[PDB]
Amino acid sequence: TMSSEHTCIDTNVPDNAACYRYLDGTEEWRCLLTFKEEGGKCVPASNVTCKDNNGGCAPEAECKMTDSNKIVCKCTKEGSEPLFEGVFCS
Known part of the structure; x- marks a missing residue:
């Protein structure tokens, strides 16, 4: 790797x-x-x-929509590390 x-x-x-x-x-x-x-x-x-269900987020990411109705995903469950999009945060 x-x-x-x-x-x-x-x-x-x-x-x-x-x-x-x-x-x-x-x-x-x-x-x-x-x-x-x-x-x-x-x-x-x-x-x-x-x-x-999660507009493209992760099993531990929060879903939030913008003024354009676009679902944004951000993972941050304390010590969480979202990857590029957050669909998978360490």
Whole structure:
């Protein structure tokens, strides 16, 4: 992993998404805030927002909408480290 990226080494990581490997050597692939993976494939959300389930956030991220009705995701549960989009925060 270069030095310690903790990112998967060869798991399923579709484009427009972010993948990260856990400390147990496991592997997880997440999608951006505008992409949702459903069935192993990820597609543009647009309709996904706070009104729905995490408009592209993470299992530990808060959902907030902007003046444009865009769902923003930010992980910060004390000692939490959101990744790029926050869909997955350490």
